[PDB]
């Protein structure tokens, strides 16, 4: 069984920001879930660049990626995001959400192995058909915020059907923020109409998993994905007040 | 050969804080070292809590520590450091420099295996006299700031004579700070008279290793270990201005 609690008080965080969406938290020690909206918590959306987490694991598991230091040379095509127009390793490809590096991984994996692996990870509901380098925003594939949490819990515990090394590498590449109070390992995601933030907050005595998604009519309020999540984390006393 | 540069301009950082000591930096890409004082950079001191880095590696390698989640229960003895009066895992034992946890690791490792391993690591003067649970607290073990750097470089590259997994785990336990500009993996050290900060700063395109120590007449200016290092890192444009 899974314990869930609907906390509509968190709605004020989306409302004060003229936004709509869902924040889902999971308290690992207590085996208890929390969300502002249980309906939307279970609504499946395209993962967008949150798909960089399973893609990284699969690439590492198959040897497409040797380790976190291997260099993926820039193909020489000048794109709008300046940080993409250069060489990268797994750490920086993840940090700058370098889509062409990940399109190349997906093509090397191929749709037969990508499909088998996603079924092994029990990752959303997939229907890839001649779109290996775009299914994460096609889509192609859809995943809910509660399903993002089940997948992340497996990753955190090294329980996915890949080596412990591959899972450790991806968790290192997911490193977003750390200080004396907490460690955040996460992945942002954006594709027309939906923005995501998924990952976890490691504390000394507990791990709080999180998955949020929000309506993004334009690419304007990308900062709200982390800001809204942090407002919920602060309300719940998971992270300190700045 | 090893390239060193003495930059006496960094002395103003120790000066302005009514302190004395050394900051040693190593630019990995350029294979170039930098220091305010070459004499003190090579002066050997008690490693104190920086010894938690090889102690962790050896415990993991021998199976004394199964993984970063294994719990070392508090024995119920009330000690001066409030954070020691609780259960720890490898992450929190390192963060809070929990001496009783590490004394237990050392006893399990034993004298013979501790000595062989420190020689395999080329760790300082490689002297474990006298007691296996206190030689780093008040024994004959000595390490210089440049020797801390040689050891840390090996750890960073997974080049120490332990498994890749053990080195990955210790580097995770060393996680101190991370943001969009840099990642710091380090270990503080304090024992009467000397304070240490050793580790590295990971950037997108380089790694800067660091080892500092300073005179600590009392346990008052512990914050200066990190503050002085960061002033040097900011002067050298390694990390941005806050």
Numbering used by the authors:
A (entry chain B), B (entry chain A): 22 to 214, 219 to 267
List sentences from the manuscript:
One of the main carbapenemases is the class D β-lactamase OXA-48, which represents a major public health threat because of its rapid spread worldwide. Although OXA-48 hydrolyzes penicillins at high level, it hydrolyzes carbapenems at a low level and shows very weak activity against expanded-spectrum cephalosporins. OXA-405 is a peculiar OXA-48-like enzyme, as it has lost carbapenem activities and gained expanded-spectrum cephalosporin hydrolytic activity subsequent to a 4 amino-acid (AA) deletion in the β5–β6 loop. Kinetic parameters confirmed that OXA-405 behaves more like an ESBL ß-lactamase, rather than a carbapenemase.
The crystal structure of OXA-405 refined at 2.26 Å presents the typical class D fold with an α-helical region and a mixed α-helix/β-sheet region, with 96% of all residues inside the favored regions of the Ramachandran plot, 4% in the allowed regions, and no outliers. The asymmetric unit contains two protein chains, A and B, modeled with 246 residues each. The crystal structure of OXA-405 showed that the 213-TRIE-217 deletion did not modify the overall structure of the protein but resulted in an important decrease of the size of the β5–β6 loop, with important consequences on the overall shape of the binding site. Clear electron density is observed for both backbones and side chains, including the active site and the β5–β6 loop, with the exception of side chains of Lys218 (OXA-48 numbering) from the β5–β6 loop and of Met22 (not shown). The Lys218 is flexible, as shown by the reduced electron density observed on this side chain. In contrast, the R2 substituent of cephalosporins has unfavorable steric clashes with Arg214 in OXA-48 that are not observed in OXA-405, where this residue is absent and the β5–β6 loop is shorter. These structural differences explain the systematically lower Km values of cephalosporins in the complex with OXA-405 compared with those of OXA-48. OXA-405 features a more open conformation of the active site due to the absence of Arg214 and its stabilizing interaction with Asp159, as well as the smaller size of the β5–β6 loop. This leads to an increased affinity for cephalosporins and a decreased stabilization of carbapenems in the active site, thus explaining the important differences in affinity for these substrates observed between OXA-48 and OXA-405. Our results confirm, that the four AA deletion in the β5–β6 loop observed in OXA-405 is responsible for a drastic loss of carbapenemase activity, particularly for imipenem, and a gain of cephalosporinase activity with the ability to hydrolyze cefotaxime and ceftazidime.
